[PDB]
Structure formats: C-alpha cells, structure tokens
C-alpha cells in the first residue's frame, strides 16, 4: 500500500477515539451524557457510544468534539464542559496541543480576551469527575490525555476532477444542440454531518455517515436556438443568477449561500471550514453582503453574414449537490447558479462569425 504511505499516521479527523487522563489510578474514560444536554464526566471505561468521539477539524486546526451516541459536541460553559447541540458557538471549538507523541491536552480560548487560554482537567483520579478549566499548563501532567482506542473510518470515495466543459458543437443548420453539455466535476469537499440538515437523526449520522460531501460541477446550459436570416437582428431571453427557492434550500441544507459576486457565504455552522470548503471545490468567498438573485435579460443578436446561420446560446452553470457516505444525493431542489457573464454561442456553419451583440434590457 505504498500509494497511501501518508495514511499510516492519519490526521485527527480520520478515526474514532476513546480518551482517558494520563495519571488516572483506575480505568476511567471520558463519557458524554446520554441526554442531548448534560455534563461531561470521566466514567469507568466500557463499550458504549457515549465514550466514543470524533474530532472534526476546522481551517485553523481547531476541532469540534462530537460523541458517537447522539452527535452533541463539547461546549465550554462557566466552570465545566457540557455536551450540547452544535450551533457554531465559539465555546464549541477546542485545540489539541500535543505535548509529546502520545500525550496531549485540550485548550479552550475565551471569546473575550484571546490571551486567556485554559486547559481541560479533572479534579480527581480516583472518582468520576467533571472537566474543569485551569491556567496551569507548563509542566502540568494533570491535563494530559491519552487515546485509549483508535478506530479508523472508511471515508466515502470522491470522484476525480475533470477538465472544464467545452461548448457543444452543432452538426447542421437544423441542429439545435443538446440542452446541456457534460457536467464536469470541479471539486468535492468533506463536510461534517453535524453541519447539514437531513431526515436522519444525528446519532445515526455519527454511526453510518459521519462525513457528508458536497460535489461541485459545471456545465453549459442552453438558452435559445434559432436560424438567423442574413443581416437579421433578433432579441433573445437569457436568465442569470439563482432562484429564491434554490437559495433557501442550499442555505438550509449546508448553511451556505451565494452572494451577488458569485462568491460563497457561510453561516455560523460552516464558517470555520470555509477555507477547506472553497479550496476543495475551487470556489471563492464572497466580498459583498448582497445575495445573488434571479434576473432575466434580453439581448440583441445580429447575424452579420451573407448567408443564414444557426446559432445556439449557452450559459455557464455551477451546481452543488449534497451526498451521504453511501453516495445518495440529499437535496431534492437543485442548487444551480447561472452566470450570464460567461456565454458561448454554438454555430453552424462552424466557420461563421459570432453574432453582433446589440443592446441589453432587464425584465422585472
């Protein structure tokens, strides 16, 4: 398996773990409450999903610590750590600092005053205890954690990225061309199951599909086709943007929206993974606070040739689909964005000229 030599020592988000504190006298393991809310305890070790956790990484290296029983995450409260539903709160992002090769501590950063970093620590090694905070970090082995168990995950396969789609070719003057070209795969990104919405319960997601993935494709979408008489000018309708229904479905699905500049906007849940999301899908983060809307244009096209020419207009389409680990598509509403600033005109005969663009109007 020399092709995957970099997977022999995997990153923190590629396996389920069982944690314990280093200087514990009895076999105590970190235990999450069975209820969606409650305190985190160090209970006696057993084979129960309350003691199995997954560290979902974020852009800056921090992790979201979710349990395999119900999917709730570590939430830093007043004096102890509780297990609450993930909402993107800053109290739910922790940092693993490896003191040695096999020991590490978990640090929480106070949203107010970034110089106040505290490590998780129990107040007993002989009895069950909650997880408290401490500012004594240097040469303090009471905060050190060891992975008692490590079970590797079988992540879903991601399709290979294909090159950008080319404009369809017309075979004759009566050929209107295909409605859509081939959907080229641009990128795919892994998204934690706690950041999406689905009819499957979070507890079952953590067991059968702890990672979803978004696929990004591009293709050419047909808008109009006509046989232009020589010297004739026609007005054709072209659509651009994204429908309000698609904008809301994508926003409720993966907590991402499309801005007016065709950049992506991330909500409270996915803000911490926008770097890896955009890099994997080859997208950009929006720079405007305006959202992309649906707009209808009419453009004047003139055939400046001595002979009749068949023309077909295409607009670049950008599509996102949400998939589970078994490959099934989640969203039943298409997440498609049309950009009228990227158009190609299939023509016959092929050696003919491009139609002259006249004036453009906007239909309300």
């Amino acid at each position: 398996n020399l092709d995957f030599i970099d997977s022999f020592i995997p990153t923190e988000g590629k396996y389920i773990r069982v944690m314990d504190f280093y200087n514990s006298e009895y076999p105590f393991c970190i235990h999450a409450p069975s209820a969606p809310n409650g305190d985190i305890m160090t209970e006696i070790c057993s084979r129960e999903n309350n003691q199995y956790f997954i560290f979902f990484p974020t852009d800056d290296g921090r992790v979201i610590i979710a349990n395999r029983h119900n999917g709730s995450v570590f939430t830093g409260e007043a004096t102890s750590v509780v297990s609450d539903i993930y909402t993107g709160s800053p109290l739910q992002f922790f940092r693993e600092v490896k003191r040695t090769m096999a020991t590490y501590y978990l640090a929480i950063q106070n949203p107010e005053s970034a110089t106040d970093v505290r490590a998780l620590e129990p107040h007993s090694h002989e009895l069950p205890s909650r997880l408290y905070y401490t500012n004594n970090i240097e040469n303090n082995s009471n905060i050190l954690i060891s992975n008692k168990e490590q079970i590797y995950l079988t992540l879903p396969s991601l399709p290979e990225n294909e090159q950008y789609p080319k404009t369809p070719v017309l075979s004759g003057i009566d050929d209107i061309g295909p409605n859509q070209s081939e959907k080229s795969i641009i990128g795919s990104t892994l998204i934690p199951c706690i950041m999406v919405s689905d009819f499957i319960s979070l507890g079952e997601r953590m067991k059968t599909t702890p990672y979803y993935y978004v696929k990004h494709t591009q293709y050419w979408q047909s808008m109009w086709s006509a046989l232009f008489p020589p010297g004739s000018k026609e007005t054709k309708t072209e659509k651009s943007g994204i429908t309000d229904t698609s904008q809301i479905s994508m926003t409720d699905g993966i907590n991402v929206s499309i801005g007016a500049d065709f950049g992506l906007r991330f909500g409270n849940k996915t803000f911490g993974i926008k770097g890896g999301f955009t890099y994997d899908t080859k997208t950009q983060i929006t720079n405007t606070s305006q959202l992309l809307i649906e707009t209808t244009y009419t453009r004047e096209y003139t055939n400046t040739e001595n002979f009749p020419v068949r023309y077909t207009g295409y607009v670049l389409a950008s599509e996102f689909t949400l998939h589970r680990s078994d490959g099934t598509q989640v969203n039943t509403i298409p997440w498609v964005a049309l950009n009228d600033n990227y158009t190609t005109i299939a023509r016959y005969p092929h050696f003919a000229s491009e139609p002259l663009l006249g004036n453009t109007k906007i239909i309300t």
């Binding site: 020399l2 092709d3 030599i5 970099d6 022999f8 020592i9 990153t11 923190e12 314990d20 852009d59 800056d60 290296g61 693993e96 600092v97 490896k98 003191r99 040695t100 090769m101 096999a102 590490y104 060891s146 992975n147 008692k148 168990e149 490590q150 990225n161 007016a260 500049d261 770097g275 890896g276 955009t278 890099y279 080859k282 997208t283 950009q284 983060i285 929006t286 720079n287 405007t288 606070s289 305006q290 809307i293 707009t295 906007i362």
Partner: protein
C-alpha cells in the same frame, strides 16, 4: 489539479480607478505634490492622479483580507499611525512586515446586475475606510477616515471611496507540478551493491504551494525584479527513500548500527531565514509572524498538516542492534521516509532544499532476498542523543523487519507503552 485556487485579483496587478471620477483619476505614483490645501504629501504618500498609474496586486490572506503591493517598487500599502486633519491616517508605502496596519478588507457594493458595482477598502474591523482627500478630479493623497456614510445612496463623501478595476499586468505565476507515486524500497542487486544514495533516489511529488514574494527571502534579486518576474515562488513537497545504512552482516552475528534521523538545527534556521517556516516534532509545519498569515493556504497546497506541537524537530541519534539468523553473509540496507521541501523560482531555478528524515516510516531490503534469506531482526534499541522528549520511546524488542514492508512506529509496541 494541482490548483492553488487563487482569486483573479491575486493574479493581476490592477490599475485602480475611482468610479465617479470624470477625468480618469486613480491611484498613482506621480512625483508631483498634492494640489489640495489640507492634503499634504511626501515621498511615502499614496498619490491620486490621472497620470502615471500604479499597478497593484492583492495577496489573499487566510482571513480573507488582502495585502496591497506595488509592481514597481515592491512595497505594500500601510496605514500610518500619524494623524492628519479631522483625525485621519495617511496611506503610505512601506516594506512588508505582516503587521495589522498593512491588512485591508475589500467590500463590494453597487448594482451587480447592471455591471455597475464597485468596492471599498476598510481597516480596523470596518471602523475606517480608504478615501480620496477631498478631491475627485485633482491630484491628492489617499487616507483612511472614521466618517463612514451610507452606501445605498452613494453620498458625495462615499464617492471618494469607490474603486473599480481597469488595466492590469499579469503576475508571474509558476506552473504547479503534477503529483506522482512513491516507489517501493530499493532492493540491492548483489553483495557489493551498497544501495541507493539520497542524491540518486527517485522522488515523488506530493504537493506544492504558491508563495508571495513578500515572505520569501531571496538575496539574488532586488525587490523590483522579485515582484515583476517572481510574483509567486514555487514550494514543492517531495518524498523519497533516504538510506540510513548499508552493511554486510555476517552469519548468526549481532552488529551495532547507528541511525541518524530528524533534521539539523542549521537546516531549520535556513528555512526560517528564507521562508519563516520550520518543521515541528510531529513533522508538521510551523510558522513565524511574517508568514503566519498564509499558513492555512500553504498547508492545503503542500498537503502537509499544521503542526500540533510547539517542539521544534531536531537531530535524533539512535543505536540499534540487529541479528542475522541466516548461515550466510547478507547485504542489508535500511531506508527511512524523507520529506523534502524545494523552493524554486518562476523560471524553475532551485533556491534551496530542506530535508527532514522521518524515522517513523522505515524498511529494510537485502541480497539475497526472500525466500533465500530470513528477515533481519531488531534485538535492541537505545536513544543516544536527542534534544527533546517529544518521542522518547523505543521499539519493544525483538522486532522483525521483513523485506520491503514499512515499519510504522506508531503501530508497534513501544517502551514506555502508548495508546493506553
């Protein structure tokens, strides 16, 4: 792929013009002073004129903000702490330092539907905005003001802050190399075959990143040529099998062999000097102030993770004892996985190389090979010299190094025990 996913504005030196100017005024490097009364200029001021335009690139930071750099002198924009009239700060030219006063946020506004949109520049978390000093069609300076006015009605004062893209020069961007697979551990051909030396080992490409020249320390070029012809540097990540030792082990004998892995301190300081980067004890990437603003984009391109330790990787000297169980003399060679980083210019010239030898992934080959000979056995392990206790563990002996297989240290029993 590979695709670093740079924005368009991070690949072009754009000429920035005011949207509402009627005579073609924009950001300029003219040498003539400002023509406005309460808008004093100096050598460092960012000028605003309709002649001698500037061409500026925007280096994308991890947080989404940008570093605005000039194509000719290679310097960047800077919000000086000096105060002007009405409590305003001038925008000056200055060498890159990575301070907050050199980071700028771009906010798009206007009618995207009609193509009439523009963008502004904000500082200090949307509390100040870059503005022309009083004039729209006159030679003046650029500053930042806390007088932010509404955007939905482009007020007169807001018009002094609207920028658009015009002409551009393409930035010098090297092509990313395609990845390749790592070969198997080389097998010796005879008793005299001493194995494959590092200077001859076949390398596999595993990653690459585009580095802004502002964080690259290249002595052979000046800041002007380094901005135009080497706007981005190429940083490749390669892997190869680094030979640790090669030796004939006699029959039924135990020999003591030294194994040297890790990375030297002079090599670490070299990479810190040129790139403000170095390797951690967990073989992850660590960064310093000048380069920490881009550390997330760099690691995603390199496919090397951010380090989760503050311990610097150092020299590791270990003494091993192996036993040859065959009744003949066998040539034994051991290789460890090397992690190689190479900084190259746009034309492809290599600036420097930095190699760290990962002792956690090692294997052995031999002649004669299986099934003629039996696998070598590790019978003793002692750590001789190491300046940190990040990994002070030894292999639980005995341990058999089968021919070809890679011994992953984290998957073996160690002393003291781990994963407990």
């Amino acid at each position: 792929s590979l695709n670093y996913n740079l924005p368009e504005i991070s690949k072009k030196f754009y000429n920035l013009k005011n949207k509402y100017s009627r005579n073609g005024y924009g950001l300029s490097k003219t040498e003539f002073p400002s023509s406005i009364e309460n808008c004093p200029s100096n050598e460092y001021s960012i000028m605003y004129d309709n002649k001698d335009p500037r061409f500026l690139i925007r280096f994308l930071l991890d947080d989404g903000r940008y570093i605005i750099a000039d194509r000719d002198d290679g310097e960047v924009f800077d919000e000086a702490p000096t105060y002007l009239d009405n409590n305003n700060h001038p925008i000056i030219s200055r060498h890159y330092t990575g301070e907050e006063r050199q980071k700028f946020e771009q906010v798009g506004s206007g009618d995207y539907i009609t193509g009439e949109q523009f963008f502004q520049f904000y500082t200090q978390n949307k509390t100040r905005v870059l503005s022309n000093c009083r004039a729209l069609d006159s030679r003046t300076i650029l500053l930042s003001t806390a007088k932010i006015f509404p955007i939905y009605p482009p007020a007169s004062e807001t018009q002094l802050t609207a920028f658009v893209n015009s002409s551009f020069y393409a930035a010098a961007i090297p092509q990313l190399p395609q990845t390749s697979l790592l070969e198997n551990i080389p097998e010796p051909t005879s008793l005299d075959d001493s194995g494959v030396l590092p200077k001859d080992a076949v390398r596999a490409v595993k990653g690459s990143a585009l580095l802004p020249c502002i964080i690259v320390h290249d002595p052979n070029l000046n800041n002007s040529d380094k901005m135009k012809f080497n706007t981005y540097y190429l940083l490749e990540y390669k892997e190869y099998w680094h030979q640790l030792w090669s030796q004939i082990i006699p029959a039924h004998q135990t020999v003591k062999i030294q194994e040297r892995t890790g990375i030297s301190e002079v090599v670490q300081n070299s990479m810190i000097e040129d790139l403000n980067m170095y390797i951690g004890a967990d073989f992850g990437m660590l960064f310093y102030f000048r380069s920490s603003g881009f550390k997330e984009q760099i690691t995603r391109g390199l496919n090397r993770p951010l380090s989760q330790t503050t311990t610097q990787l150092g020299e590791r000297v270990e003494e091993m004892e192996y036993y040859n169980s065959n009744d003949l003399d066998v040539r034994y060679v051991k290789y460890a996985l090397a992690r190689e980083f190479t900084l190259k210019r746009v034309n492809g010239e290599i600036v420097k190389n930095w190699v760290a030898v990962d002792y956690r992934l090692a294997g052995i080959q031999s002649y004669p090979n299986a099934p003629i000979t039996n696998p070598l056995t590790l019978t003793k392990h002692t750590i001789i010299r190491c300046e940190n206790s990040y990994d002070g563990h030894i292999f639980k002996t005995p341990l058999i190094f089968k021919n070809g297989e890679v011994i992953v240290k984290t998957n073996e029993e160690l002393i003291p025990k781990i994963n407990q």
